[model samples]
Structure formats: structure tokens, C-alpha cells
Target: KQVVTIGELLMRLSTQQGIPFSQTTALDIHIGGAEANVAVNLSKLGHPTRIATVVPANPIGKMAVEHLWRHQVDTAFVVEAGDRLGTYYLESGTALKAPSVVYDRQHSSFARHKSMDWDLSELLKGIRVLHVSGITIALSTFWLEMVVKIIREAKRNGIKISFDMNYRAKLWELEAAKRAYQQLLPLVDYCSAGQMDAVAFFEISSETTDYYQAMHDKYPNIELFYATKRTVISASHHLLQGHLWTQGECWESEEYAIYPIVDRVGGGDAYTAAVLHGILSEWRPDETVKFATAAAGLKHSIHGDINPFDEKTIADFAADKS
Candidate 1:
């Protein structure tokens, strides 16, 4: 596998953009998760991607699998048989108001499979890159232990590790997340985090854009550090850009002015996947940042968690062509 992502896949219920949960009479449904989103986006970008997750042995789970399969994601490693599928309700917000997420994930299929001790050798066979996020690691103590085991074994196998610091305040406390991230950062090869995640999880504060170097200094194993800068003009519009640090150099992309955002749920996941795709394809640092920012910027026009843009679309966007 070129890329394999391990995490929970959930069904998303969202009111129309800018609609509050209380006022909305109906919601649009989509299947989404941080890791799965990355897998789907990479697969669409023509990368060989696979997603390993546990879902309930039910129609809903089947639907989720079909969704990934439709996006060309390999789903052979998906394990089914648990209580129910995990779900989250989203109420989109507009100017001066932030979006809200309510997770109803307790006792969900993936979380219920507490000890996710799959055979690493078989699961990671031919996998060049293994991706995971903090959300999966913070699901529970059992999940955390499982992630540690996976990362350790992946490291021993010489597989490149991609760690996304998807800090979910709803899933774990600040101190708890801080401690868990501290343990995992040193094992990561590629790291994706936001400015807030850097501040909250790593406690690295800098007025300048040197925060990536500060984070890399704390965890010397991180060969590449990626982060995005977003200016939220509203729930429906924003400016987005990406930063990539490697070889003691930092590269920043041109600002992408996104308007009438269809959805912002998977922008970060899209950005991370594009960055990984660029690195795996041996693109230069400048090209990687440009590709990632363009992909992420385009994601704002989509309504689901997956960035459906293909390579041609992103390349054209990066070239500033219609």
C-alpha cells in the first residue's frame, strides 16, 4: 500500500451550512472520519490508499464501506461486528458564530473493539506510509495503548509514520491529550498540526512562524512538519494557506481566498493528504505546499468530508487556471 490510514469511520449528520441545530428541520448525511477522509482524498488523487477500521456488522457499516469503495479506497482490512456505528451531529455556523460538533460515539463499533491488536506484519504489508490521528488515540485507554503498539511496530518495520494532531477537546481533556501526544510525537516521521494544537499539545509558543522548528526540536524524529494557517472570515468564507518545514527550511503557500464555503469539515484532512501525496511523489517543497493549499482550498467548496478533487483539478488550481 502506498498509504494506509487507521482510525474510526463515522456517519455525519449536518444541518445546511449556516443553519443551527435547533432551527434546522432536516440534515444531510455523509460518512466521514479524519483518517478515512485522508484515505479517500488520496485515493481520488490516484494514490493507492487503504483504510483499516472497525465498523458494526450492519447496513450502516456496509454503507460506510461502500462509500469508501466508491471513492476507490481499499477496504479489505475493515473489520465488522459490533454494537452500532459511531455518529456525530454537526450544526454549521456563520459569521461571528463557530460550528459545533456533538459526538455520540460511546460504545460505538470501533471504540467497542477496545483492543485493536491486529497483526501488524499482515496489516502493514507493503505499506510505505501509515497514517493515524490523535482522535483515534484518544478514544480510550485501550485505543491509546493500541496506537502505541501499532506505531512501535510500524517503526520497527521501517514504515514512514504520518501523525495528525487532531486534538478533539470533546474526546479528551487538555492535560490528557498533552501527555498522550508527547509520547507519540517522537515516533512520527511526518507531523500535521494546527497552531492551536502546537500550543495546546506541545506547549510551543512563538510569535513568529518558527513554531514548526520548535516542535521539531522537541521531537527530532519528525522529518517533515506541516501546518495550515486559516483566517475565518465566517463559517462560509475564509483565507487558507499551508506551511511545510523540512531540511531546516520552511515553505509557505500563497493565500487561497475561499468564499461561500460549502463545508469546512475536512479541509485539514485534505491538506494533510495532499502534502503526503506530494512527498510520496517526490515533489519539491514549494510544489508540495502549493499543491496542498490548492487542494485544501478546493475542499471548502465540497459538502462532505472527502475532497473529491483529482490531481488535474488541484494542479490547475495551483497554476491559477480555470
Candidate 2:
């Protein structure tokens, strides 16, 4: 019984690979998604993790599946054959370059998923945790229905659910996201979110000024509400903080300074996965949050969305935290 995540996986094409996307004849590609990145990091930390996503039955989807398998993730339930692979843009940030996105994910394979396509029994068996994200729920009406079905079934099977309210303003309008998120709340055992995400879903004002206290009041019923507090001073350097609550107890870790952010796309996912792993290991509250925060900090120094750190790195950070 380890970790299993079901969601949409996208192929990321970035600018600034020695040349701009506009100027370059060739492009850079990486397999990335909010939930998929978490699955990668969780597996790297010695967890038996499974990732399920609907990809096109094309060469691109096959390559992505091979990428995950090469990284040691279980791809047993990845379905294929809907034509398009969900694709995204990542413009690398620099003082000289304005980072941005131009999404072309409409009519993607995973976007076409129906509830009947997911074999819930085999997916949830021998899995200790089920992970999903807000982005998946926001994809389309069909995806939203599929997410709801997954949650309802997972809970009834006694599997723990962890959700990341990974809000993307560009994906859906405020009202639509709000309604879907509210309905999904009661089904989750753990929640991962940031400042604006919490504000949008819970209607908490003064989010930047007193975020922890505001979150405490709004989501008291959540078994654990974990957040990565980030401070971006520049395009390359940042400050990282972590806060967590379990049962009636709360914990926070001192901020860690990170410089020259190599790849910032999956920092939050790394933090969430580490915290989820720590909780599954029955770690103390402070230890769990610290390990989570440290995982994110380490991710900042890496070149891809998935961090490649092993147990020795996590052990060192936990020791220093204590």
C-alpha cells in the first residue's frame, strides 16, 4: 500500500533552450503535470507510486510513458488513444525575458476521459493513498464528472484521499472553479494549497497578511491543511516557507533561502509529495513540514520539474531541522 495518482499529464515545451521558441528550429520537451510531477518525486523517495493518465495512442504518448517508466514509476493503468496529448508552454524566466504560456490543450486525450473508462477497483487496490488535483477537475465537464466519481468511489473503498487545490486562473472562470472545489472538499482527507488558491476557494481576504490564521479558521475540518509559503524576490532567487496542520495541532518551519531557481515549475508539487510521504510514514508534525519545505528548496536547484533527490538528502535535511 503506497501512493497512486490519477490525472492528466502534459508534455511541456519551453522557450530559452539556447534559443527562443520563436527563433529556434528545434524545441525542448519534458513530460510534466501537477499530479504527475508529484508521482515522480514520490517514487524517487523510495515509495511504490502508480500514475494513471489518458494519453494519445500516438508516438508522443508512448514516449511520455517510457519517460515515466525510465524514472521508475508504475504506468500500469495509463490508457491511450484519443488523438491529442495535453501540451503546455513554459517560457524560461530571466530579467531579459518575460516568462509566459500559450496553452494548446483543448481536445486532448485525457480531456476526453469518461467515468466508465477508469477501472476503480484495480486502480485503488493495494494503494494506501489516492492523489488528485484541482486542474484535473477544471479540465472539462467530462473530467469533472470523472473526478467526482473517483473521489466517491475511493472514499467508499476506505482509501485516503489527498488533493491539491492547484488553481489556475486561465483554466476556468472563478465561479465555475469555486463550485467544483466546494463540492470536492468533504471527500478529501488532506489538502495542499497556496495563498491565492485558498482565498479563491474559501473566500478568505487578507491572505498575504495573515494566511495561516485565515486558513486555520476556514478549513478546520480538514485532517491536514499543508501549504508552501513562497517569497519571490527576483526571477532567480526566492524564499521558501512551510505550514501544516493535522488534527487539532499545527506546525511551521523556518523559511529556507533558495537562489538561481533552475526550474520552478514543480516546486510546489515536490513539497506536497514530500509532506504526503512524511505523513504516510507517521512523522511528527514539525518533522513532516520541515521535510516538505526542504524538499521544495532542493527542487529549486534542479533542472527539471521532478526533483531527483534520494533518501540521504531527505535524511540530512530532517536531521538539520531537528
Candidate 3:
């Protein structure tokens, strides 16, 4: 069984040393997207995975595909016929200041795609899990319809669906996001959402069982739900704890402190990948939560958007020995 994720691919430009765009002459480049990040991390851990998305038929698109290829992610399904690839800029934060992102992704290649009917049957033959996030659906009305169709197709083929409520404040309205979630949640088998996501999109508190119970009652297909709690001490320091709930049982991961954070952008995706890996490998629920929490804690030390840490590295981190 393999995992397949669908979303837009982005080229990220970030200012070094938490500098603002107005003062930065030099910037670092990284390739990142919610779905692509998970695929890349899982591929690094020797998982059979593929990312399906669109990029421009240009050198930039070629470079994006090459980046994924370098990390051992399958790029065979990338469509290259659009005019431009999506791009975003980041200004890192420090002390009490917050990081900011400027998106230049409007009318990008993926958004301009004609339709979502690109016969994925052959491509999805061995894919047992389909992962996607709210960011993709919030991109545009086109993507909303497209993702709905994609999820329906995957469901028809009996593939498990993994959904992450990766809410982006800059993307869509709360009510609009709520409407989309109401339609998509029923089809999901697993979900990744935090307290903030619960409040913003579902208008429910994550700290209480009321939200979980209500969701489970409404969506009988969802067998598992998980989230990570973060304690941000500073721009370069943080602590993370994980939670998993399934079959009327809930488990929480030990808190792992991450200091001297290098980059924190793709951490959530890395955690999600670890959880999926543990599931596909048939690991115990507690072990899965510990592994995912540790994997995310390790991402703070990595510079780029993709987590290249292998199984051994993650295991070492989970072992709590440096």
C-alpha cells in the first residue's frame, strides 16, 4: 500500500535571520506545500509515496520536480502545462515578533488547470491512503470543487482518507471554511487538527471531549483523530506534546522540548507523515504518537521545508537520548 497526496507546490523565499522584506537583499529558497511536505518526509523515511500536482511547463517547474526527486519522492504525476508556478515569501520571526508570509501564488499553474478529471485510476492503483489539507481547498472555488471530486473518487475506490485542518488565516473566510469542512469531514477516516483549528473552523473547543464526541457521532467513518499541543517559549525554543484518540481510547505523547529552532515551517507535515508511517507499518497507538511527536520536534533543527531525517534519526529522538 502507498500514500498519495494532492495539492499545489510552492517555491518559498525567506529572509535570513528573521529580517523583514523591506530590509532583506538576500533570501533563502525552499520548496514546500502542506501535502508535498508529507510526501517528501515519508519518502525520506523509505515509504512508497507520490505527490500529484501541477506546475508550469518551465524551468521553475522542472526544478520543483527535481527537488522532490532528490528527496526520493515520486514526481511522475506532476502536470507541466501551466504558465507559472506558485511562490511565497517568508519573513522569519524572533523574540516577541511574529513571522509573516506574503503570497504571490494567485493565478498560478495549478489554479489555472482546466479540470480535475485527469483519470487517476491507474496512478492510484496501489494507493491505500489519500492525504490532503484545508489549505488546498481554500485556494479557490476551482480547488474546492476539484478536491471534492478527488476525494469522492478515492472513496469510491475504497481508499482511506487523511485530512489535516491546516487553516490559513489569509486563505478563506471562517464560514466558508466551515462549509467546506462540513462536506469533507464525513468522507475522512483520519483527521489532524489542533485546538486553534477546532475553534476557528468548527467553533468547538479541542480541550474538551464535546468536539470529538460530536464529530464522531456525525462522521461514523472517521476512526481516528489526532493533534499536537505546542508551547512556544520563543522564536528558537518550543515544547510539543501529541494526542491520539481512537475506539473510545485516547493517548498522549510525552512533551519534547526543542531549543534553538532552525526552521519550523514543515514540522506539522513531518509529524503527520510519521503517524501515517506508523499506521501503515502497524505500530501500536502509543508508539505512533511518540514517534510522530519526536519527528516533529526534530524538524526544528532542519533548515528546509522537507524533513530528510530517516527512521533511525526519528527513533533516536523518540528514545530521548540527545
Candidate 4:
């Protein structure tokens, strides 16, 4: 069985699309993150996945763990005992405008985590892969230290590392981001990022077009670089693509048509999850991107923070297999 592990869990709240936060009646609640959502999607596809995260010692935190547990993800590593968990506010935009996220994650339990929390060696014993994201680092200095500690342990334990360059504008300066990413890029076995993150982390000029060219210039050490390229047609519809650079050549993925996005969240996490699964399974280039696109496209139609799809459904969508 393919066993994947990831860190971080967050409670996200958002107003209805286009509704001002001041006017919204209530905040829609969801639990997710780059790493957490990846674990959810992987487990939903029948892979054995575990999540390592710290949350507040409250009902909300327990609910978060129970939430993933209900989805069949292994949450034995989730820790609870702090004032509050991380929180995010999303405002989904319409027309050509994209959705935006605002993080209120200062002093979160995970953000306050130090090296004293858990036994990493025991938690990671049977795991084949470890996943994390820049968003966790953006949360706090403590979280950043936790990420570094985890990466160091992963390397020593011979576990693969996967990272997503989830850049948050409010997190840090560009130069700080560059330094942070560069230090970790060489050790990452699989890297997932987006167009804006590529520009930010690599300091590529806005005029740059070739992604792999950009990737090679700054991060020549990266082996499996996956980028999600998207064309926004409207609020609900998008033409999405995945580009991969591995084995000395770059492969642009097949397009996946998406529309009527029920909730424009966790789509990219779904894509990253499928790509991880693809790399693990040794699926062909075309098949890998196609499946990743299908999973991402399917996420746009779902309401919650996680994509809910079985293996048969994803394979059918990717291979046109009935």
C-alpha cells in the first residue's frame, strides 16, 4: 500500500461568494490545508495516509481530527493543547477575478509547536513519503522551525519529502521567501507550486514564460517539479493544466475542463495529491496529468474543503473508462 504522511491542519471560514465579510450572516466553516487536504485526497483514493498536526485543546480541534478520521485518514499524530487553531478566511471572487485568502493564524497551536511535541521517528516509521507546505511556515517562526526539524528528521530517516510553494502575500518579504525556499528546495523529492509562487520564490520577472527554464535557473537541484497552470475563463469555469519537469525534459499536461465551481477551495491540493499518487504509481506522463486534472476538476464541484472521490471515479474520469 502507498503510505503518505503530511503535517498541519487548519480551520477555514469564509463568507458566501462576493458577500462582504461585514454583511455575511455567518462564516462557512471547513478544515483543510495544503498538507492536510493532500492526505485527505490520498486516503480517499484508498491510499494509506497519515496527518501530523497540532490544534487547540477544544471541541473545534477534536472536531477537526474527527473530521479527517471520518474520511478514513490516520489522525493518530494530531496533537491538541493550545489556545486556538489556525484560521483562514476565503473570499471567492467572480468573473475574471480569483479567490483570495486571508489568514488569521497568529499564535496557533501548531504555530507555537516546538521540538518537544512528538516523537518524529515513531510517527514516521512506516511512512513512505512526507508532505508539507510553505503556508505552514508562513504561519509563524515556531512553525518554520517545526518544518525544518521535520525535514531534517525525514532526511535522516530516509523518507521522501514533498513540498508545496503556497505563497501568501502577507507572510513574508520576497527575499525572505527566496532564502527559505532555496534552503529546502535541494532536499525536496517532489515539489508542487503555482505560477505566482514560481515568480515569487525564484524572483523571476513578470515577463518570464518558460517555467522549467525558470525552475532550472534557480532550483537545478529539483527533480520532480510540478506546476499548476490555469486559465481563468470566469468565476466558475477554468481551463487547468499541470506541467512536470523530470528526467531532463518538461512535459505540459493535458487540459481539464472545469465549470460551476461549487466551492473554489482545495482544488490545487487535489491536483498535488494526484500528482504524488501518479509519481508513486509510476503512471505515464499523459495519464498522470490527466488523473491529476480530473481530481482537481472534480474538487471544484464539491462543497467542502476536501475532494471526495473514489479511485474508480477518478480513473473513469481520467481514462474515459466506463
Candidate 5:
């Protein structure tokens, strides 16, 4: 009722304790997707969130569905028509190193999607916000048209469209991604754009991370622009700050230092969830950025892929400047 997210739901197999794949005999299995992460994070914050995705009619698919339910995300709209679910292998980062990924998403149920997969009107019924990301745009030729169609329907239904420019270089080329971004920008009301997305697709320069004005002028319809800045002390330690622009003003959250982080995955989505919550709750501009940044910063301490912290937890973290 509050938010509906449509994207690929993927499973992650990983080695523990920062061990390399070659050095590990066993792997830990986790369920995650950018959209699902945001849904779960939002649900944990007491938002009524629903996830619309596709998975095969099998054990793997069932596990994914159950995982979403356990996280308090509604799975009623999920489709069970694929032959397989997307999966990826990961090696957790340690020290001054980085984590690596090997994705196996080709022909996955979600990737092999069709435009008529869901009825746009029915899906948008009673939904206040429709959240999606660049992942679905680059998903396939048949899919872009579908998402675009849904965005138009959402607009007509007076629903806010929250879009995240989550372009992965691994998923597409620059020119290809740029073309799609241009198509969706005019339709989106809320945007999650960063320095990378701004410079690459929108051609906005961010020499001092002050590209919001430039962004607003270009995409005049986008009411909110949210992003984060990070300083890498090492793979295990980092500094995170959130930035939000709305009503011709810029707001920055306090920079929090996360040391010996348990995990860094899903942190960005956590930030997105908090900002969406802020919009829904009518929080002040400064409060939105602070809470959203704190929500993301707290994700580092949780080992799982979903952000389980509640509003008070995140707000307290935001208030702790010392």
C-alpha cells in the first residue's frame, strides 16, 4: 500500500570471514536484490512494502519468497513463472582490498521478462509510490518498454515514482545506459543520483559534490535528488555522508565513520529506503538527510543483506554527532 518495488530478486553465495573463494570450502547463502533490499529495509521501518518479482517454481524460488515474507515484505504480487532465479557469488572485502562478484543472471526468470508480465493499472492500484532502478531498464529490450509503461501509469494514478540510478558498469555500457536514463528521467518524481550517474549520463559536473542545482535545472520534474559520499580509509573502515536536494536547497548528513564493518552490501538501498520514508512521513529536509545517512551507516554493522533497524535506532544514530 505504501510502496511497491519491481526488480530482479537474486541469491548470493559467499565465503565467510573475508576469505577468498579459492580458500573456502563452503559458502553462505543470502537473498538480495537492490529493490528487495530497499523493500525489506522499508518494511523493517514499519512501512507497508510490497515486492513484485519473478522466480522459478522451485525450492530456490520458494526460499526467496519466504525470505521476503520473513522480512515483512508482501510477496502477494510475486510471479512464479521462471525456470531459474538469478544468482551471484561474492567474496567479502577485507583491509585495503575489495569484494568481487561473479554473476549468473542470464535467462533467469526475472531477466527473461515480458512487457505484459503484469497489468499496470492493477499493480498501481492503491499504491502510493512505485520504486524502481536502472537495473530493470538494462534488464532487457522487452523490459524497458514495460517499466516505462508502468511509470506513465503511476504518474496518471498520482503515485510518486522513486527512481534510483543504480547503473552497474557490469550490466551495461555507458552509451546504452545513457539512452535509457534519458527516457525515464522525465517520468520520475524522486531520484537517487550520485556523482557517477550525474557525470556519466546527465553530464553534470560535481567538482565539489554540489551538482544538485545542475541536476534540478536539467531534470526539472525530478522533485528530490538524493546521494551519498564515502571516503575509504580501507575496505574494513569507511566514512559515509548523505546529501539530499529538494525545493532548491541542499542538505548534508553528518559523516559517520564505520570501522570493522560487518558488511557493506545493501547500505545504499538502506539510504534510499530512509529517504522514501522521510518523504512519506513528511520529515523536515535536514532530518531526512540525517536519518537516511544514519540508516545507511548502520547497515555496515548488520551482517545480513537487509537493514533491520527501526526509526528510533536510526534517529538516535543521526543525533549522535560525538
Candidate 6:
């Protein structure tokens, strides 16, 4: 089975380790989006993945495309259009300070482009799972419509939709985003959601005992739901766990202690990639949660947004605890 992902791929300018934006001498540059990040990791994990999104018709866009190429993510659906690629500035967190990002995404390539621009028949070709996020939908109403149009088309084609609730308060307000989410949730088959998202968007309470149960009961269309249980020991060290809800039970994974974190921007996306990978491979529920959590733990030690580790490596790590 193949996967097709869609979102805005941004240029990430980050200060050196533990440096704040106010006092930074140098910055490292990387390219990624939640959707693209998932595609990259999945491709590396042995699923041929394609990413569909727009970038500028210039060197910067070419740079973004090349990054995807280097990760072995198929770019057959990637388009070169629009005036510029979006960019975000990251202030790396220290043991005491949490990481912060400043977005410069308005009017950029991916958000401005309409979803209807690409025919679904072309983008969904040979693709089993269509992965996307609420982050793109929060960018603008143009993309809110953009995401829905293609999602509807995907549904008709029998493609399973994997939607992530990557809610950013910096991007949009709760009430406004809730309306858009209401439209998107019914269409999703697999969902990447946090406990807070369950409370905010769907009125499901904090754990309130069972977040996944509440979510699935309300939105029966969502067959599978995954979330992380993260206890931040500090800005750079944390205890991470993953949960998968299916049928009627919540499957929890082993706790992983990820310390001296290199980057945490795309940890959730990495987990998502592996979760979908496990689902597509028909792995057991426990195996899926274990591998998904381990894959994300590995991403924290990585510098960029994409998880560069392979399936065997992640599986071994998942089982290596002594």
C-alpha cells in the first residue's frame, strides 16, 4: 500500500542548540511540513510515499523538492507554483526554556493554492492512505477549502484518510477552528489527536477517564485513534508513551525516556508515520504502538523534522529495552 500526503513545506531557520532568537549567531536551515514529514519517514520505513503540495517556482522551491528527493519521498505529485515557499523561525529550547516558533507563512505557495488545482484521480493514484493535518487547514480558509475538496474526492475513491489534529493556537482561534474541524472529522478514518484536542474541538474532557473512547463514540467514523502521553521532564528531556484506540479498547505502549532532545518539532508526525505503517502492514495492536512510540522517540534525537531511521532500526529499538 502507498501513501499520499499534503501540506505546506516550510523553510525552518533555527538557532543553534539552546540559543534563543534574541541572541543567536547562527541558524540551521531545514525543510518540512507535518504531511511531508510523515511522507519522508514512511518512505524511509519502506512504504513508497508521495507528497502533494505547491512550492515556489524558484531555487528555494527547488531546494525544498531536493530535500524530499534526498529522503526518497516520491515527488510525482509535487507542483512548482506560487511566489514563495513559507518559512518559520525556531528558537531552540534549553533544559529550562521551551522551544518557540515564529511563522511567516501567509500568502506562501502551499496555502494560497486551491486544493482543486490538482485532480484527485492523479494524486490518489495507487495510494491507500491520504495523510493530512489541521495545520494546513488553519493556515487560511483557502486551504480549509483546499483540504476538504481533495478529502471528499479521496473518500469517493476508497482511500483511507489519516488526519492529524495539529492544532496551533498561534494559527487560529478555538471556535473558528472547531467549525472547520467539524467538517473534517467525519471524513477521517485514522486520527492523530491529543487529549486537549478531544476536549477543545469535540467537547471530550481531559482524560475524564477515557479520551479515545469518548472520541470514537462521538465520531464512529474514525476507526483508529492515536495520541501521545508526554511527561516533559524538561525542555530537552521527556518521558513519552503512545496510545492506540480501536474496536473498543485503548492500547498503551511502553514508556520511553527521551532525553537531551535534539529536536521535537516533528515527533508526532514521526509517530503518525509509523502508526500508519503498522496499520498498513497489519501489525498487531501492541506491536504498532510499540514501534510508533519508538520511531517518535528516535525523531527527538534527530536534528530535522523528518525521521531518518528505518523500520528495522525502529523495531529493534522498540524491543531493545533491558
Angstrom error of the Cα, residue 180, model 2: value is 0.2
Model 4 lDDT tens row, 1-322: 4455545677888878778677878988888877888988888877788877888888877878888888888877777777887788887676666777778877778777774666787777787788888877776667677678888888888778888888767878877777888778877888887667767776777688776668666777666778677887888788887777776677776677677667868888898888888887888776787788778877888877898898779888877721
- TM for candidate 3 is 0.94
lDDT by candidate, in order shown: 0.87, 0.81, 0.84, 0.78, 0.88, 0.89
Which model is ahead, 2 or 5, in terms of lDDT? 5
In candidate 6, what are the lDDT values of residues 141-241, reduced to their tens digit? 88888779888988998999999998989888999989999999999999998788989998887747887888888899999999799999899789999
Write the residue-wise lDDT of candidate 5 on 1-322 in tens digits. 4899888888899889768989999989989999999999889888888877899999999999999989988888899986999999989888878888899888999898673667666677778899999998898977788788888878888999999999999889999999999999988899999888888988787674667778888989999999899998988989999999998888998788899888899999999999999999988989899999989998989876888888998888678774
| TM-scores of the candidates in the order shown | 0.94, 0.92, 0.94, 0.89, 0.96, 0.96
Provide the global lDDT of candidate 3 against the true structure.
0.84
| Candidate 3 lDDT tens digits, 60-96 | 8888889888887787888787799899999988767
Write the number of the candidate with greater lDDT, choosing between 1 and 4. Answer: 1
By the TM-score metric, which is better: model 2 or model 3?
A: 3
Candidate 2 on 1-322: residue-level lDDT in tens? Answer: 4788877788888876335567756557888888888898899888888977888888988978987897788888888768888888777776444466779888888887664666789888888888999899898888788778877888888888899998888889889999998888877888986677667877778425665456656666568889877777877778888889776565888888777667788889999889988888888898788888888888878766788898678769757855
User: Considering summed lDDT, which 10 consecutive residues are worst modelled in model 2?
Assistant: 206-215
Model 2 TM-score, all chains together: 0.92
Best by lDDT: 6
Off by over 4 Å in 4: 1-6, 17-19, 96-102, 203-209, 217-220
How do the residues 1-322 of candidate 1 rate in per-residue lDDT, one tens digit apiece?
Answer: 4788888999999988667888899989999999999999889877888877898888998989999889988888898868899998998877667788888888898988855546677788888999999999898888788788888888898999999998987888999999999889889999998668778877887564777777778788899989788988877679888999998888999987887777888999999999999989989999999999999988888888999888998999899832
The global Cα lDDT (0 to 1) of model 1 is 0.87
Q: Which stretches of candidate 6 lie over 4 Å from their true place?
A: none
